[PDB]
């Protein structure tokens, strides 16, 4: 299993559903096997430039350890989830647990 | 640029400041560059000449 850092932007109207989606994603990693090192919710933020005419979005960041399956499964979930508007996945070496800037 | 103007700012001085800001930005040179397509070999030669001139300038300053 490798280490991945995932940042997701979520449409504001579905901001109340963020807790369910993050819970389901975490449950998938745990049931597969995985290891979840970080999970931060930055909250609503004004975007530097509009995306799809949206000017504010909800930011959620997560650092996990998983395998290729768990991975491609998560990317296709993000692909077919309408609430998620833009995602960034960066591979990392070793896990990061320290609190990151912009936490709240 | 976005040169916001003070209540008593004269138009001429405002235009001078706007020209200074545009010169700092360098948009005009970028606009000029794209007027005609320049070939990669010519661009590489131009950059080589620029580097050669820069190094000579540095040596002259050090001297």
């Amino acid at each position: 299993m490798r280490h991945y850092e995932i940042v997701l932007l979520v449409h504001p109207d579905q901001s109340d559903q963020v807790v369910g989606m993050v819970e389901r994603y975490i449950s998938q990693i745990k049931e597969a096997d995985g290891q979840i090192h970080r999970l931060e919710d930055w909250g609503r933020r004004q975007l530097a430039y509009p995306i799809n005419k949206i000017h504010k979005a909800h930011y959620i960041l997560m650092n996990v350890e998983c395998g290729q399956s768990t991975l491609d499964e998560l990317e296709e979930l993000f692909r077919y989830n309408d609430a998620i508007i833009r995602n960034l996945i960066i591979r990392r070496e070793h896990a990061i647990t320290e609190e990151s800037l912009l936490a709240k | 640029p976005q040169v916001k103007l003070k209540e008593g700012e004269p138009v001429d001085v405002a235009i001078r400041r706007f020209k200074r800001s545009c010169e700092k930005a360098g948009v005009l040179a970028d606009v000029r560059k794209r007027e005609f397509y320049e070939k990669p070999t010519q661009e590489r030669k131009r950059k080589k000449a620029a580097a050669v001139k820069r190094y000579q300038k540095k040596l002259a300053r050090e001297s």
Partner: protein
């Protein structure tokens, strides 16, 4: 008929001509003038004087709508870009701000070939 208090001015300055269009906010047009149209139809279209005359006539025409404060957006190269704002100030518009909006491609389409003159 329509009355508006604030508006925008767009200066399309090129190497052959200068267009000055005074619009309201949201981009609906109110007046427009051209250096070549305002006489001076020749190589002098690109001279600063023609741009100044065009700006003067455009401002005088737009004064009918009761515009006192203007925002200036200038596009592209060409002599006469500076003359437009000077003419607007002379005719009496209070310029809130002046900004440049010239497009910059990030290495997109291929430009035409070099002239051999």
């Amino acid at each position: 008929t329509r009355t508006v208090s604030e508006g925008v001015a767009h200066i399309h300055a090129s190497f052959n001509n200068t267009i000055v269009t005074i619009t309201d906010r949201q981009g609906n047009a109110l007046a427009w003038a051209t250096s070549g149209g305002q006489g001076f139809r020749g190589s002098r279209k690109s001279t600063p004087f023609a741009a100044q005359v065009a700006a003067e006539v455009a401002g005088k025409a737009a004064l009918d709508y009761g515009l006192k404060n203007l925002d200036v957006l200038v596009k592209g190269p060409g002599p006469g870009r500076e003359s437009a704002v000077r003419a607007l100030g002379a005719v009496g518009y209070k310029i809130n701000s002046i900004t440049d909006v010239t497009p910059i491609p990030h290495n997109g389409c291929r430009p035409p070939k070099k002239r051999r003159v």
